[PDB]
Amino acid sequence: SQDLSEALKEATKEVHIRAENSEFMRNFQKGQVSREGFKLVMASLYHIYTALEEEIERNKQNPVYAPLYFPEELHRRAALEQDMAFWYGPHWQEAIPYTPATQHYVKRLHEVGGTHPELLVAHAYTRYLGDLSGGQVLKKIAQKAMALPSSGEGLAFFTFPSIDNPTKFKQLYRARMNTLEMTPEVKHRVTEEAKTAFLLNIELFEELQALLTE
Amino acid sequence: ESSFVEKMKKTGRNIIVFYGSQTGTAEEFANRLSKDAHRYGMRGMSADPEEYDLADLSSLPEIDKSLVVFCMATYGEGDPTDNAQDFYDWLQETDVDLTGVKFAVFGLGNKTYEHFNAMGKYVDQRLEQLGAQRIFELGLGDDDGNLEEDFITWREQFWPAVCEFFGVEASSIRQYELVVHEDMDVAKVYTGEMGRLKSYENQKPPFDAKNPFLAAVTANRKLNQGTERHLMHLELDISDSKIRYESGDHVAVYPANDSALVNQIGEILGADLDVIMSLNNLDEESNKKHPFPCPTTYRTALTYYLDITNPPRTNVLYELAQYASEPSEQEHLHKMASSSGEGKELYLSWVVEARRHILAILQDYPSLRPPIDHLCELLPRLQARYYSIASSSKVHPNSVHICAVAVEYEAKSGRVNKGVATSWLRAKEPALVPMFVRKSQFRLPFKSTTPVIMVGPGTGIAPFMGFIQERAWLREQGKEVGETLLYYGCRRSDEDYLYREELARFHKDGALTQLNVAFSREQAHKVYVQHLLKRDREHLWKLIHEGGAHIYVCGDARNMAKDVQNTFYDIVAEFGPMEHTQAVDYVKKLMTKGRYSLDVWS
Ligand SMILES: Cc1cc2nc3c(=O)[nH]c(=O)nc-3n(C[C@H](O)[C@H](O)[C@H](O)COP(=O)(O)OP(=O)(O)OC[C@H]3O[C@@H](n4cnc5c(N)ncnc54)[C@H](O)[C@@H]3O)c2cc1C
Ligand code: HEM
Ligand SMILES: Cc1cc2nc3c(=O)[nH]c(=O)nc-3n(C[C@H](O)[C@H](O)[C@H](O)COP(=O)(O)O)c2cc1C
């Protein structure tokens, strides 16, 4: 369609279905994750968000992204740190792993923030929105699986302090994207980049599945 | 497995609970529910339905005083769950006769889907169709609000009704123990703060739901120009909280029941309110230790902690039945727990409708001399009330402004009732207020050029004042302000036309482009903001479609918001000519894009 938000869903409709039917995801959805399995993914995600949020910080004032800056409502780094402390203990720092898939993703992020700011938004679209759709169910499966405290420890990444209605927030987010000024050439680039980002996630999921059942 | 009929009489039970669970939420509900029976008269067992022979259902009435209950989750487009498959298709293609079988169903769901609790609805309907009889309302849990809350509500009122149909009745089993701390040091007793002790005195950020800031009321003026109702503008100073907010945001508030009202209860109940105490949750591995901040007085509780205004739930009336010496008095109370018959007819009429609060009940039932500690168990907590912020942080960094109607009315109870927050708010003269700021995604667009439609009849004009302020501010900064439309409405021009002068000022300053005002009782045919919209249609359409305008509807939800929605549908349907149904799709897409945003209540 015409509006960025509308476009992106259509352009990543295919990729999403494959990301969600990868073995890791499907198993997760029936409640089948190991403590190690969960531990790995979170660790990987920490790096991703550190890179992503670094880039965001760098480009928070460039109008190709400034309208999508939500430090209060979204930023995941501190929350992820909390979960690292919980899951890897006081030594989480270099205790957490750094998989090849993760690395590749991060370096792509660096490039994007480094020379392709206009495209950041594709990554952001993939990430944050996912967390506010699938994420809430995923949080709650964790309790059945790992039977953790409804004190909430270990699930900071899945808990959204400032956001009173994820449905509502998605609303706003989509509108925000539309507010970016871009040529439909650039729109197509962004759509491509969305697909790329999806692929990056998908590759991770299949990697880690190998290393669990192992 | 070997038949469930046999296994009930063999394991010594009458009640059976089946769960259709995918992610284990339904199971959780089922297990808590059959464990309620055990100390509520009877004795239940929760089972996986896929492992028992389900023809045996009309074989249930062979167990005396038997009831069967269903906990099922709705999946996809209203389709069944895993362990529920065998049953479902049998049900779809059976009609063998279930006469005499007692049942009840709870649905697990989400309002954002249009097949809301379709699973639960189906099962509930189907059983009736076969000759079977419903005992309690079909529950409609909602994950959009809070599914858990919806469940707990339903459960709270189920058991009392179940008891009444059958007879049973231990009708009294406690959940807290009273521990008088009759001689105890002063500063370890709660005075009505919400979080930690002396939270209201030691004010440091974070400020939120559990550490409210206490904002000092800078002013209160009656905007109400007539006498019909009292409508008021208050100014709350948050100077050193360093709380931030954005226009259209909410400010939440922690009120206190009017102490006068409090006192009457204490009197007619006949205890000392100032009795320092605690109620301790005796179910030891429950880390929910007291229903409200303890240690504290009954005075402190009834004033700041408990909800003494919104009528009783069914269950509490059943609980209280026991303190009536009068047989007749007892009977009434007992009846109003029935989920049907006369019993249900009454309760809705003379309690919920008539808006008889706790106090009224006591006044209308002399026998009710229940213990104050036990009452302070049975009362719901005082819910905070929230208010759409009516200011912009760019013009009022240090001030949160509210707009509201003060509540007051003759009920059928004969009793004049009062609004908690609103009356409380009203009394705050130019006196501190405990409040926090909760984020909404009711927001102005980023591009100052973007045009805005604001629809705000009544107090709903509230957050839109903030919007207007922000737009005004933009023009001071030399930024390009887009088209700015306010579609406001009130009863009569000289009566309740909120912010008359300031709005007019905004009009002539260029900041507000069009001030359209719907005066509804200035004629014998009613004039609503939909009418205004209809009148302007073409102008609106060019804004939405060419300008890329945003849509905001704030205010009454029951009728107004959806009337406005219908008007917008008709605008779309005729002007980029559509099927009615095409227009609806377009509208919906708009919302998704985040161009049509709401903010309502009742
Ligand atoms: C997200 C949100 C934003 C809101 N923003 C605003 C705002 O900006 N301004 C505003 O005024 N309100 C707003 N409200 C509504 C508000 O929070 C309260 O419902 C209202 O202000 C009354 O609170 P109270 O404690 O004073 O009255 P309460 O003591 O709670 O009693 C009021 C209740 O009693 C009942 N009642 C009232 N009149 C009658 C009658 N004649 N017959 C029978 N029953 C009756 C209704 O149940 C009513 O809701 C908002 C609500 C929500 C959920
Ligand atoms: C657990 C399996 C998942 C399911 C069932 C699922 C389902 C959905 C659904 C139904 C939506 C639409 C939300 C709405 O109704 O508004 C959605 C949105 C989204 N999902 Fe997922 N999802 C899953 C996992 C993922 C994954 C792995 C990612 C990528 C990391 C992802 C990224 C997104 C994004 C970016 C959106 C926003 C799309 C939009 O703008 O409409 N999701 N998901
Ligand atoms: C994929 C999915 C689709 C859903 N679709 C609907 C729906 O159309 N209507 C509805 O009322 N609820 C729907 N729900 C709400 C679920 O029934 C709800 O999350 C429930 O709490 C799950 O219960 P369980 O954990 O016992 O399986 C859906 C939930 C999920 C996970």
mmCIF file of N, CA, C and O and ligand atoms in Angstrom, chain A residues 5-6 8-10 12 15-16 18-22 25-26 28-29 45 49 105 122-135 137-138 166-167 170-171 173-174 177 197-198 201-202 205, chain B residues 112-113 589 592, ligand 2:
data_model
loop_
_atom_site.group_PDB
_atom_site.id
_atom_site.type_symbol
_atom_site.label_atom_id
_atom_site.label_comp_id
_atom_site.label_asym_id
_atom_site.label_seq_id
_atom_site.Cartn_x
_atom_site.Cartn_y
_atom_site.Cartn_z
ATOM 1 N N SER A 5 3.564 1.768 7.118
ATOM 2 C CA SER A 5 3.109 0.765 8.069
ATOM 3 C C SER A 5 2.376 -0.330 7.340
ATOM 4 O O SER A 5 2.632 -1.532 7.572
ATOM 5 N N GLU A 6 1.442 0.083 6.482
ATOM 6 C CA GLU A 6 0.634 -0.865 5.695
ATOM 7 C C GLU A 6 1.565 -1.715 4.826
ATOM 8 O O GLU A 6 1.400 -2.941 4.741
ATOM 9 N N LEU A 8 4.743 -2.422 5.093
ATOM 10 C CA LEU A 8 5.723 -3.295 5.733
ATOM 11 C C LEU A 8 5.102 -4.613 6.082
ATOM 12 O O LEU A 8 5.757 -5.632 5.881
ATOM 13 N N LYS A 9 3.858 -4.594 6.581
ATOM 14 C CA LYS A 9 3.154 -5.826 6.963
ATOM 15 C C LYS A 9 3.019 -6.736 5.744
ATOM 16 O O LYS A 9 3.268 -7.943 5.824
ATOM 17 N N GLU A 10 2.633 -6.135 4.626
ATOM 18 C CA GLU A 10 2.462 -6.906 3.401
ATOM 19 C C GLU A 10 3.772 -7.502 2.943
ATOM 20 O O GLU A 10 3.829 -8.675 2.562
ATOM 21 N N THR A 12 6.471 -8.198 4.675
ATOM 22 C CA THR A 12 6.996 -9.170 5.618
ATOM 23 C C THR A 12 5.939 -10.187 6.016
ATOM 24 O O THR A 12 6.152 -10.963 6.949
ATOM 25 N N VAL A 15 7.579 -13.696 5.439
ATOM 26 C CA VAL A 15 8.717 -13.985 6.304
ATOM 27 C C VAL A 15 8.251 -14.316 7.710
ATOM 28 O O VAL A 15 8.837 -15.187 8.348
ATOM 29 N N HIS A 16 7.240 -13.589 8.186
ATOM 30 C CA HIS A 16 6.710 -13.748 9.526
ATOM 31 C C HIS A 16 6.226 -15.177 9.734
ATOM 32 O O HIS A 16 6.528 -15.784 10.782
ATOM 33 N N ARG A 18 7.160 -17.859 8.251
ATOM 34 C CA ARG A 18 8.238 -18.810 8.345
ATOM 35 C C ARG A 18 9.006 -18.678 9.647
ATOM 36 O O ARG A 18 9.412 -19.689 10.209
ATOM 37 N N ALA A 19 9.154 -17.447 10.140
ATOM 38 C CA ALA A 19 9.820 -17.210 11.417
ATOM 39 C C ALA A 19 9.070 -17.897 12.536
ATOM 40 O O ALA A 19 9.703 -18.541 13.395
ATOM 41 N N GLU A 20 7.738 -17.800 12.496
ATOM 42 C CA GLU A 20 6.885 -18.347 13.554
ATOM 43 C C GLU A 20 6.691 -19.856 13.495
ATOM 44 O O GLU A 20 6.252 -20.445 14.473
ATOM 45 N N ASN A 21 6.984 -20.478 12.357
ATOM 46 C CA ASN A 21 6.865 -21.937 12.237
ATOM 47 C C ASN A 21 8.202 -22.685 12.311
ATOM 48 O O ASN A 21 8.223 -23.910 12.174
ATOM 49 N N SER A 22 9.304 -21.952 12.522
ATOM 50 C CA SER A 22 10.622 -22.561 12.780
ATOM 51 C C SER A 22 10.503 -23.438 14.022
ATOM 52 O O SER A 22 9.628 -23.201 14.850
ATOM 53 N N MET A 25 10.356 -21.933 17.650
ATOM 54 C CA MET A 25 9.212 -21.101 17.949
ATOM 55 C C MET A 25 8.028 -21.988 18.222
ATOM 56 O O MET A 25 7.296 -21.726 19.187
ATOM 57 N N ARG A 26 7.797 -22.973 17.356
ATOM 58 C CA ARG A 26 6.615 -23.829 17.469
ATOM 59 C C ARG A 26 6.636 -24.575 18.803
ATOM 60 O O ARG A 26 5.614 -24.643 19.516
ATOM 61 N N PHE A 28 8.249 -23.716 21.480
ATOM 62 C CA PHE A 28 8.067 -22.697 22.510
ATOM 63 C C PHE A 28 6.582 -22.446 22.751
ATOM 64 O O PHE A 28 6.132 -22.362 23.887
ATOM 65 N N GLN A 29 5.851 -22.306 21.650
ATOM 66 C CA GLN A 29 4.412 -22.084 21.668
ATOM 67 C C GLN A 29 3.619 -23.222 22.337
ATOM 68 O O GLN A 29 2.498 -22.979 22.782
ATOM 69 N N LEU A 45 19.776 -11.847 22.516
ATOM 70 C CA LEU A 45 18.898 -10.697 22.381
ATOM 71 C C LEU A 45 19.505 -9.495 23.038
ATOM 72 O O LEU A 45 19.299 -8.392 22.515
ATOM 73 N N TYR A 49 19.918 -5.841 21.284
ATOM 74 C CA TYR A 49 19.271 -4.619 21.728
ATOM 75 C C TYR A 49 20.302 -3.577 22.099
ATOM 76 O O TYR A 49 20.053 -2.412 21.829
ATOM 77 N N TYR A 105 23.948 -10.289 12.972
ATOM 78 C CA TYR A 105 22.811 -9.405 13.137
ATOM 79 C C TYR A 105 23.311 -8.028 13.640
ATOM 80 O O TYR A 105 22.952 -6.953 13.093
ATOM 81 N N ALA A 122 13.274 -0.257 9.780
ATOM 82 C CA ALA A 122 12.889 -1.611 9.409
ATOM 83 C C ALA A 122 13.173 -2.568 10.572
ATOM 84 O O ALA A 122 12.337 -3.422 10.928
ATOM 85 N N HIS A 123 14.360 -2.409 11.150
ATOM 86 C CA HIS A 123 14.766 -3.258 12.270
ATOM 87 C C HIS A 123 13.825 -3.044 13.446
ATOM 88 O O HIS A 123 13.381 -4.020 14.093
ATOM 89 N N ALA A 124 13.542 -1.759 13.691
ATOM 90 C CA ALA A 124 12.703 -1.379 14.834
ATOM 91 C C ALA A 124 11.319 -1.975 14.675
ATOM 92 O O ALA A 124 10.767 -2.498 15.658
ATOM 93 N N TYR A 125 10.790 -1.915 13.449
ATOM 94 C CA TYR A 125 9.472 -2.449 13.131
ATOM 95 C C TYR A 125 9.422 -3.941 13.458
ATOM 96 O O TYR A 125 8.459 -4.425 14.086
ATOM 97 N N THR A 126 10.474 -4.642 13.030
ATOM 98 C CA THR A 126 10.573 -6.083 13.231
ATOM 99 C C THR A 126 10.567 -6.398 14.720
ATOM 100 O O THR A 126 9.842 -7.323 15.167
ATOM 101 N N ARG A 127 11.352 -5.613 15.464
ATOM 102 C CA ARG A 127 11.661 -5.966 16.866
ATOM 103 C C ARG A 127 10.514 -5.684 17.880
ATOM 104 O O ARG A 127 9.905 -6.608 18.482
ATOM 105 N N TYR A 128 10.332 -4.391 18.100
ATOM 106 C CA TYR A 128 9.493 -3.889 19.157
ATOM 107 C C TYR A 128 8.069 -4.351 18.958
ATOM 108 O O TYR A 128 7.420 -4.756 19.932
ATOM 109 N N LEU A 129 7.595 -4.272 17.710
ATOM 110 C CA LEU A 129 6.216 -4.655 17.415
ATOM 111 C C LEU A 129 5.988 -6.120 17.731
ATOM 112 O O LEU A 129 4.945 -6.447 18.301
ATOM 113 N N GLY A 130 6.965 -6.964 17.398
ATOM 114 C CA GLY A 130 6.919 -8.389 17.693
ATOM 115 C C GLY A 130 6.724 -8.633 19.186
ATOM 116 O O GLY A 130 5.856 -9.428 19.625
ATOM 117 N N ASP A 131 7.528 -7.908 19.956
ATOM 118 C CA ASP A 131 7.505 -7.987 21.413
ATOM 119 C C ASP A 131 6.141 -7.640 21.952
ATOM 120 O O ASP A 131 5.774 -8.171 22.984
ATOM 121 N N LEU A 132 5.377 -6.804 21.256
ATOM 122 C CA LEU A 132 4.060 -6.380 21.748
ATOM 123 C C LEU A 132 2.892 -7.196 21.153
ATOM 124 O O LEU A 132 1.697 -6.896 21.365
ATOM 125 N N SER A 133 3.230 -8.245 20.422
ATOM 126 C CA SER A 133 2.186 -9.069 19.861
ATOM 127 C C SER A 133 2.360 -10.478 20.389
ATOM 128 O O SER A 133 1.637 -10.900 21.288
ATOM 129 N N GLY A 134 3.343 -11.188 19.855
ATOM 130 C CA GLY A 134 3.667 -12.522 20.327
ATOM 131 C C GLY A 134 4.191 -12.495 21.749
ATOM 132 O O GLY A 134 3.983 -13.452 22.493
ATOM 133 N N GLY A 135 4.817 -11.379 22.137
ATOM 134 C CA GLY A 135 5.651 -11.287 23.324
ATOM 135 C C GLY A 135 4.845 -11.549 24.587
ATOM 136 O O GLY A 135 5.330 -12.222 25.495
ATOM 137 N N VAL A 137 2.104 -13.317 25.112
ATOM 138 C CA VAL A 137 1.785 -14.733 25.348
ATOM 139 C C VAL A 137 3.042 -15.487 25.787
ATOM 140 O O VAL A 137 2.971 -16.343 26.636
ATOM 141 N N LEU A 138 4.157 -15.153 25.134
ATOM 142 C CA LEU A 138 5.445 -15.790 25.344
ATOM 143 C C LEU A 138 5.906 -15.646 26.766
ATOM 144 O O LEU A 138 6.474 -16.572 27.327
ATOM 145 N N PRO A 166 -0.698 -2.381 24.622
ATOM 146 C CA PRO A 166 0.150 -2.663 23.487
ATOM 147 C C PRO A 166 -0.589 -2.466 22.181
ATOM 148 O O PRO A 166 0.022 -1.978 21.228
ATOM 149 N N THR A 167 -1.880 -2.820 22.150
ATOM 150 C CA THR A 167 -2.727 -2.628 20.967
ATOM 151 C C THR A 167 -2.736 -1.143 20.581
ATOM 152 O O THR A 167 -2.547 -0.756 19.405
ATOM 153 N N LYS A 170 0.771 0.062 19.302
ATOM 154 C CA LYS A 170 1.002 -0.343 17.912
ATOM 155 C C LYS A 170 0.360 0.678 16.958
ATOM 156 O O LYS A 170 0.966 1.089 15.980
ATOM 157 N N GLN A 171 -0.885 1.030 17.278
ATOM 158 C CA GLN A 171 -1.599 2.141 16.651
ATOM 159 C C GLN A 171 -0.605 3.280 16.384
ATOM 160 O O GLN A 171 -0.292 3.604 15.219
ATOM 161 N N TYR A 173 2.570 3.675 16.861
ATOM 162 C CA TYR A 173 3.827 3.336 16.225
ATOM 163 C C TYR A 173 3.683 3.352 14.727
ATOM 164 O O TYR A 173 4.547 3.924 14.029
ATOM 165 N N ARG A 174 2.603 2.743 14.244
ATOM 166 C CA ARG A 174 2.345 2.657 12.806
ATOM 167 C C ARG A 174 2.211 4.071 12.224
ATOM 168 O O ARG A 174 2.783 4.373 11.168
ATOM 169 N N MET A 177 5.522 5.810 11.862
ATOM 170 C CA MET A 177 6.314 5.413 10.707
ATOM 171 C C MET A 177 5.876 6.161 9.449
ATOM 172 O O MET A 177 6.705 6.637 8.672
ATOM 173 N N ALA A 197 15.829 -8.185 8.115
ATOM 174 C CA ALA A 197 15.790 -8.245 9.578
ATOM 175 C C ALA A 197 15.077 -9.506 10.027
ATOM 176 O O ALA A 197 15.547 -10.175 10.952
ATOM 177 N N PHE A 198 13.971 -9.826 9.360
ATOM 178 C CA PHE A 198 13.205 -11.038 9.648
ATOM 179 C C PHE A 198 14.069 -12.274 9.481
ATOM 180 O O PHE A 198 14.062 -13.175 10.319
ATOM 181 N N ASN A 201 16.479 -12.797 12.277
ATOM 182 C CA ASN A 201 15.861 -13.447 13.416
ATOM 183 C C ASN A 201 15.726 -14.953 13.147
ATOM 184 O O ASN A 201 15.990 -15.762 14.045
ATOM 185 N N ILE A 202 15.270 -15.272 11.941
ATOM 186 C CA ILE A 202 14.908 -16.644 11.592
ATOM 187 C C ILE A 202 16.128 -17.553 11.694
ATOM 188 O O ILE A 202 16.026 -18.661 12.197
ATOM 189 N N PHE A 205 16.996 -18.565 15.195
ATOM 190 C CA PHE A 205 16.070 -19.512 15.843
ATOM 191 C C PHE A 205 16.463 -20.937 15.521
ATOM 192 O O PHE A 205 16.451 -21.787 16.403
ATOM 193 N N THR B 112 -10.303 -7.801 21.162
ATOM 194 C CA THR B 112 -9.719 -7.340 19.882
ATOM 195 C C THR B 112 -10.082 -8.245 18.677
ATOM 196 O O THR B 112 -10.046 -7.793 17.530
ATOM 197 N N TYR B 113 -10.423 -9.507 18.958
ATOM 198 C CA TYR B 113 -10.973 -10.452 17.971
ATOM 199 C C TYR B 113 -12.483 -10.306 17.946
ATOM 200 O O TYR B 113 -13.093 -10.010 18.981
ATOM 201 N N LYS B 589 -8.936 0.492 8.961
ATOM 202 C CA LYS B 589 -7.560 0.662 8.496
ATOM 203 C C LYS B 589 -6.968 1.937 9.101
ATOM 204 O O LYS B 589 -5.810 1.932 9.509
ATOM 205 N N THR B 592 -5.915 1.440 12.638
ATOM 206 C CA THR B 592 -4.702 0.623 12.638
ATOM 207 C C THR B 592 -3.489 1.527 12.396
ATOM 208 O O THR B 592 -2.466 1.456 13.122
HETATM 209 C C1 HEM C 2 5.056 -16.891 18.650
HETATM 210 C C2 HEM C 2 4.666 -16.868 17.379
HETATM 211 C C3 HEM C 2 4.097 -15.625 16.838
HETATM 212 C C4 HEM C 2 2.767 -15.370 16.597
HETATM 213 C C5 HEM C 2 1.596 -16.308 16.818
HETATM 214 C C6 HEM C 2 2.704 -14.046 16.073
HETATM 215 C C7 HEM C 2 1.494 -13.442 15.688
HETATM 216 C C8 HEM C 2 1.377 -12.112 15.315
HETATM 217 C C9 HEM C 2 0.142 -11.454 15.073
HETATM 218 C C10 HEM C 2 -1.247 -12.070 15.126
HETATM 219 C C11 HEM C 2 0.450 -10.163 14.766
HETATM 220 C C12 HEM C 2 -0.546 -9.079 14.431
HETATM 221 C C13 HEM C 2 -0.746 -8.201 15.679
HETATM 222 C C14 HEM C 2 -2.059 -7.471 15.606
HETATM 223 O O1 HEM C 2 -3.110 -8.145 15.564
HETATM 224 O O2 HEM C 2 -2.099 -6.214 15.590
HETATM 225 C C15 HEM C 2 1.865 -10.019 14.823
HETATM 226 C C16 HEM C 2 2.557 -8.852 14.600
HETATM 227 C C17 HEM C 2 3.948 -8.816 14.515
HETATM 228 N N1 HEM C 2 4.829 -9.813 14.751
HETATM 229 FE FE1 HEM C 2 4.410 -11.566 15.314
HETATM 230 N N2 HEM C 2 3.943 -13.510 16.017
HETATM 231 C C18 HEM C 2 4.856 -14.399 16.456
HETATM 232 C C19 HEM C 2 6.249 -14.238 16.534
HETATM 233 C C20 HEM C 2 6.967 -13.170 15.968
HETATM 234 C C21 HEM C 2 8.346 -13.140 15.700
HETATM 235 C C22 HEM C 2 9.323 -14.262 15.938
HETATM 236 C C23 HEM C 2 8.656 -11.896 15.171
HETATM 237 C C24 HEM C 2 9.989 -11.418 14.734
HETATM 238 C C25 HEM C 2 11.012 -11.354 15.587
HETATM 239 C C26 HEM C 2 7.442 -11.166 15.098
HETATM 240 C C27 HEM C 2 7.321 -9.884 14.632
HETATM 241 C C28 HEM C 2 6.062 -9.290 14.524
HETATM 242 C C29 HEM C 2 5.968 -7.880 14.107
HETATM 243 C C30 HEM C 2 7.128 -6.979 13.755
HETATM 244 C C31 HEM C 2 4.647 -7.580 14.090
HETATM 245 C C32 HEM C 2 3.999 -6.253 13.711
HETATM 246 C C33 HEM C 2 3.183 -6.396 12.409
HETATM 247 C C34 HEM C 2 2.212 -5.258 12.116
HETATM 248 O O3 HEM C 2 2.629 -4.067 12.063
HETATM 249 O O4 HEM C 2 0.986 -5.517 11.912
HETATM 250 N N3 HEM C 2 6.441 -11.972 15.578
HETATM 251 N N4 HEM C 2 2.432 -11.223 15.183
#
